[PDB]
A paper describes a structure:
The sixth gene of the tdc operon encodes a protein, TdcF, that is a member of the YjgF/YER057c/UK114 family. The location of this gene within the tdc operon is strongly suggestive of a role in the degradation of 2-ketobutyrate. Each 14 kDa subunit comprises a single domain that contains a predominantly anti-parallel, six-stranded β-sheet against which are packed two short α-helices. The most significant structural features are the three symmetry-related solvent-accessible clefts, located at the interfaces between pair of subunits, close to the "equator" of the trimer.
A further data set was collected to 1.6 Å resolution, this time from a crystal soaked in 1 mM ketobutyrate. The resultant electron density maps showed clear density for a 2-ketobutyrate ligand in each of the three binding sites. As with the serine ligand, the carboxylate moiety of 2-ketobutyrate makes a bi-dentate salt-bridge to the side-chain of Arg-105, whilst the keto group forms two hydrogen bonds, one with the amino group of Cys-107, and the other with the carboxyl group of Glu-120. However, in order to provide a hydrogen for the latter interaction, the ligand would need to bind in the less stable enol form. Curiously, there is a water molecule adjacent to the 2-ketobutyrate on the re-face of the enol moiety and approximately 2.8 Å from C2. The observation of a water molecule stacked against one face of the enol moiety of the 2-ketobutyrate is intriguing as it could take part in catalysis. By contrast, full site occupancy was achieved using 2-ketobutyrate, indicating that it binds with higher affinity than the other ligands. A comparison of the four TdcF structures presented here shows that the largest changes occur between the 1.6 Å resolution structures of the as-isolated and the 2-ketobutyrate-bound forms. A further modification was apparent at Lys-58 in just the A chain of the 2-ketobutyrate-bound structure. This was modelled as a carboxylated lysine in two alternative conformations.
Author numbering:
A (entry chain A), B (entry chain B), C (entry chain C): 2 to 128
């Protein structure tokens, strides 16, 4: 067990760490669209989706991995009518990094911490 | 890592793959009750529960594993009033395969892709 | 692929086992605040949070692991108004065991089994 800590993803606002590196596998906390430098949450769902994904990227990178090493994500969201937009941002994010798409679950929950539109957790493997 | 692809479960409805095989462990994407031959969703919750499980099965089998290798599932549902009925179908499914019940979490979310009544993700192990 | 069974966590309310020990990793089922001795659910959310965490601990300890070996939790809750209270209980729980906080996801769902206010699942690692 090694704790992952990076200033490139928002600091924990609760009793959790950003990531844990087990050697073979890295787990992230659920990443919300909070900007790591300012603490702000962007209003637009496209911008939230991108920021949540960049926050996941920051943690995986801090472990010595990259987006292509992510093998499973869960995307908790507040509105499935956002699905198409979120998916386009998500596809572009992986495509940008020449990364195979991970396995995924996506469900619409009632509400999320800080009233964000999505929260994304990831599991990555060290090859 | 190796992508799992099978015609015996539905194709991806977003930027994800059906399953990933890490050697020691297989992850599936969350499986919804879409019939792979018709692209349609049965109305009855018993039929949906069984079909989501068959979709999970197809992916685990494509990886060279069996129902008995599944060790964790998460069952997202839209109505806990369906819990007892879902549980009966789920219990029978594992019983038919002479398989130990996996660990599980079951929660009622607000909404699921294509307005299905449940979505199930699985983790299986090889050795 | 050892099943974990302990009297210090409630018996299963559906077709699942309390925990599975894979050797390298232990998974628990989602634990709800049901008292393993009495079957009763405490009314106050501070008490529900402590009890769900004790139920998780019971399974992790039954496998021969410690609170400090927990590396990921997911906390499903029904009311974000309860979040600060849950976080305080959760923080104090890890602090009492001198355990660094695991990675975490937290989401507000619509409803949980037995109408409890939270459900917590855990993953722990050996060595």
């Amino acid at each position: 067990k090694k704790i992952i800590e990076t200033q490139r993803a928002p600091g924990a606002i609760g009793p959790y760490v950003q990531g844990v590196d087990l050697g073979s596998m890295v787990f992230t906390s659920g990443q919300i669209p909070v900007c790591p430098q300012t603490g702000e949450i962007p209003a637009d769902v496209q911008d939230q989706a991108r920021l949540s994904l960049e926050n996941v990227k920051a943690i995986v990178v801090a472990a010595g991995l990259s987006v292509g090493d992510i093998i499973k994500m869960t995307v908790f969201i507040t509105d499935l009518n956002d699905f198409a937009t979120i998916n386009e941002v998500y596809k572009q994010f992986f495509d940008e990094h020449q990364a195979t798409y991970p396995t995924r679950s996506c469900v619409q929950v009632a509400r999320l911490p800080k009233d964000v539109k999505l929260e994304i957790e990831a599991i990555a493997v060290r090859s």
